[PDB]
Amino acid sequence: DVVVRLPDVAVPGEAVQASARQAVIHLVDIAGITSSTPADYATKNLYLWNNETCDALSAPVADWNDVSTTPTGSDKYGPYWVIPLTKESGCINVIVRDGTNKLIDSDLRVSFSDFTDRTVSVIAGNSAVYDSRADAFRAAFGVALADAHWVDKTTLLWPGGENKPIVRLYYSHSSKVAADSNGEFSDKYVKLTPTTVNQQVSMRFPHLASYPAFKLPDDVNVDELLQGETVAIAAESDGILSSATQVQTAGVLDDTYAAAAEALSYGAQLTDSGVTFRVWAPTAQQVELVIYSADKKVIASHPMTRDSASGAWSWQGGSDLKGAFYRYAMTVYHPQSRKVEQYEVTDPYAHSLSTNSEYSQVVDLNDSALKPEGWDGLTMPHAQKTKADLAKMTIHESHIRDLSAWDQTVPAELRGKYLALTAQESNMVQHLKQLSASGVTHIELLPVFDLATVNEFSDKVADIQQPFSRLCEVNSAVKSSEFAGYCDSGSTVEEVLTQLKQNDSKDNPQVQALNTLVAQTDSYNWGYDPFHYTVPEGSYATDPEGTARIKEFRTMIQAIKQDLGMNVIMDVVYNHTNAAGPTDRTSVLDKIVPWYYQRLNETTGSVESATCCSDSAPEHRMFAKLIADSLAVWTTDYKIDGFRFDLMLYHPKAQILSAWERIKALNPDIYFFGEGWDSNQSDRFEIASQINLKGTGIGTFSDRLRDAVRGGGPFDSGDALRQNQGVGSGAGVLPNELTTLSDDQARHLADLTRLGMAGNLADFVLIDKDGAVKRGSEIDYNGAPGGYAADPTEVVNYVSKHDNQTLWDMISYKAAQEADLDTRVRMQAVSLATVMLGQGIAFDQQGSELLRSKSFTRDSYDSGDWFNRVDYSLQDNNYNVGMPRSSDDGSNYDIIARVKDAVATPGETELKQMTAFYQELTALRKSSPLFTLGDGATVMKRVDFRNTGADQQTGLLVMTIDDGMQAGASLDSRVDGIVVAINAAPESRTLQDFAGTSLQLSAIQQAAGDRSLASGVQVAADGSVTLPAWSVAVLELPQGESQGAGLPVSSK
Ligand SMILES: OC[C@H]1O[C@@H]2O[C@H]3[C@H](O)[C@@H](O)[C@@H](O[C@H]4[C@H](O)[C@@H](O)[C@@H](O[C@H]5[C@H](O)[C@@H](O)[C@@H](O[C@H]6[C@H](O)[C@@H](O)[C@@H](O[C@H]7[C@H](O)[C@@H](O)[C@@H](O[C@H]8[C@H](O)[C@@H](O)[C@@H](O[C@H]1[C@H](O)[C@H]2O)O[C@@H]8CO)O[C@@H]7CO)O[C@@H]6CO)O[C@@H]5CO)O[C@@H]4CO)O[C@@H]3CO
Ligand SMILES: OC[C@H]1O[C@@H]2O[C@H]3[C@H](O)[C@@H](O)[C@@H](O[C@H]4[C@H](O)[C@@H](O)[C@@H](O[C@H]5[C@H](O)[C@@H](O)[C@@H](O[C@H]6[C@H](O)[C@@H](O)[C@@H](O[C@H]7[C@H](O)[C@@H](O)[C@@H](O[C@H]8[C@H](O)[C@@H](O)[C@@H](O[C@H]1[C@H](O)[C@H]2O)O[C@@H]8CO)O[C@@H]7CO)O[C@@H]6CO)O[C@@H]5CO)O[C@@H]4CO)O[C@@H]3CO
Ligand SMILES: [Ca+2]
């Protein structure tokens, strides 16, 4: 065998160092360093020019056809250029050429800031700027990137060796595959001969199927190569190295181990004989189980037993280890650092944690000590068995602090805690009970798994209800801040933020300024930042040290189900981890099985960040299993009625469906839904998207009705926030001063809205804005088909959610100056009526019934108690409490200043009216099975619309729900049909579509009287209906002694 080796030449030094007003660029001639011919550099030249970005050149020649900037000199390693400078700071613009052809196809930007001696090297066909020729030389003849992919036992996908004579999988157990002192690569290796990709490999990694394939001997000891660094290497016939790169091994790891590893259970497990510990770590050299005392002293250390089939490590000990703290002491190679790392890691399958998740803890979740009294018989107060069960779901999306941080009627020690939901006499709980009785059915909880971004050591935390001096004790940036004078003040941070409201403006955004520092060290975060997937969050417990949070969490769940009467949904975030690599405190999965649980760039091997953070890999089998095992615990041990998957579109459809069947085997009524946008991962697998989930029963948030009713889209800014009026804010019927919405555009929004009120089915047939027959899927939504679902239970409609501006803030951006406060309250209820009276699952943000505002904050995840406040004492809606944070809403301060003060801020009278409006809407939703048909074909045969086509009265939404014989049986004994009429318009309107029938106003609305959304509706003797401006009316035909003719859908 030929010995792979470096170039038979030295590692180059610097040819010349720049002097004052000079810079030097070396071109390192890799190919001519392979000598042969003493190559000629006469045609090499640099194109140099100044612009607004880089302007440090003294005599730049702008003529692109000028090729006279030839090398100042050259040696065996390549030419160099001495470039005069006007200054020694900043940067210069360089293109490196041969004649007029670029040898680097990229404008090079050489910064004197990053390169202090202004003496840099570059290589042809590469855009990187190196500080020395040795650096660039070692780049070319050393390990770089990670584009080889060991994807099963016998196959290695790599481009860097396609049609090269020598191609090779080297491996070193304990050091980094560096050439030895004889410039030779003398480490052990396996031999690869070109081959043809499996049909099962391409079906597994389709984003790689165009990679050049290679074969491994049918007898390689994969167990041994995967114990250390592997480096795929190639070179030419002489043996001079061509390239060398690191290997990604998740493919082979799954081929080798996953079948065996999936049969095992993981974490610290109480058996009848004792406790069994098991962690999956197929590449680890050693795993030691470290037992800790309650004071976190090592009291035992146990080398674990490796199972060579699964790559899992196990140890068994006594039952007295229940309650013990533990970590896994790992000895494992990490490709990012290229070191065999040694560190202790918490259990990825942890079910109990110490304060701030520093240690995992052995726990038996079944202990009656961890259960509220009665736990084992806690039942689901709302059925989820049938589709008509599911369609009835009416979700109230809430956050632990948003619920109780501000409520003085919650005991002080329960504020911002799980146990605030047990404070039966608080304003918050009494108000939620009111919502439940009126037809809100589900609480959805923003992250209550163990998040990373709140410090659970209370001494390191300052909240705005505490003295400003506590804020200075714990946030050392405050002393350096223009708020430092307040450290002495003796007043709370809350008091200071209030006092700062007076002089706050788009010119002096001071409330936001103080709050940005507050955000760093407070108790507040949405929490989309997973530390441990299957432990409750610690900071929401009264005591975060140990098992306390488990009983407190379950006590909350029981209170919601048993005292409030609602089902509970959990937000789960399996699409990313909080950190990765061998360094960061919150890297758990990537410390134990490096590069397996994260999704990597196929070339750099860098962990991807398209989700926000550290993208995870649910396409890999053991993460798929981790997700499924985790959900099993939340389902069985915490009695969670359903799960909302954050960025579900980043998961394979097959993985979500797999997880769902696993969980349905535990509880058949469990409900799955999520964000099914476009992840850009369709090249790797069929993503779990709105489109691909058609018919599966997996729900998705529909952005269709959302944007039609709100106006615009979530990326609007500046004037577009006001110009883009929605149906709810008077598009085309009550225009504001800036908008140019046409009647056609407004009628298109009404199409989307009607479509969504019928469940946003792909196959639902309606009359569109132009009078034309269209299928649900034929209504455009930003180019995509609008309707996309098979059943309404697959669609979650909403007009407000934790992310993006509240509904009230959108209405304030968009409402014409002439809409007075009462009209804006009706715009809110009218907007919500499209959701509450539609066939899709109904979803809403906590506080929409209180006109909730965030002071125009569009992304409030870290904006603290101040901007996320919800006042259950009903004094205001949190509007106009300061300019929102400039980092995300600064480019909106202008439009905000123009619209902010058009009308008064909602006070107690408006909040009570909105709450009555909202309860009236939810009571209507559950008043009849007709609103919640469940089945897509049943919707199609019973749901129609009047006031359609090109001469529709703009903004008037009229839906009919048939309960007469030309659709089927009478689902409702009381009525033969229902008419839903939403008149989102400043004019009163009259309906003649129902003249002659016995139409009459629903009893709920008649009982609300002057407070009804239908106050002032008139039904004439002949059956014509007059609708007030900005109203919602639900009309019925009373049922006769047999099922009548009702409101037959017309066949279009
Ligand atoms: O004013 C137009 C322009 O303004 C800005 O560009 C400035 C830029 O930021 C400065 O750095 C500098 O530009 C220098 C540039 O950075 C260097 O790369 C170099 O340019 C050379 C190219 O590298 C080289 O490849 C070749 O370019 C040829 C192209 O390969 C070829 O495709 C064709 O170009 C035509 C394009 O096909 C066509 O798209 C159109 O170009 C328009 C741009 O698409 C459009 O973005 C805009 O450009 C802005 C730009 O956004 C700002 O950043 O308008 C363009 C003009 O219509 O038409 C092209 C030809 O008409 O042909 C070229 C020429 O052979 O050679 C060039 C040689 O210049 O040097 C640049 C100059 O030092 O300055 C500009 C401002 O002047
Ligand atoms: O990842 C960065 C991003 O994260 C957060 O955004 C989240 C957002 O809050 C959620 O609503 C959701 O977004 C999904 C959305 O709900 C769905 O409807 C759909 O989005 C479609 C739109 O409905 C549709 O309008 C169209 O989008 C077009 C825009 O209308 C148009 O303006 C333009 O967008 C450009 C922006 O103008 C420009 O500012 C820039 O956008 C960047 C933002 O400035 C920056 O804040 C950040 O966005 C964050 C965001 O703040 C978080 O809240 O990065 C943005 C770039 O990614 O550039 C835009 C051009 O890309 O053009 C688009 C069409 O190209 O189609 C979209 C796409 O289907 O799906 C959305 C999923 O992405 O979730 C996201 C992610 O968590
Ligand atoms: Ca240098």
Ligand SMILES: [Ca+2]
């Ligand atoms: Ca935590």
Ligand SMILES: [Ca+2]
């Ligand atoms: Ca915070």
Ligand SMILES: [Ca+2]
């Ligand atoms: Ca990709």
Ligand SMILES: [Ca+2]
């Ligand atoms: Ca009936």
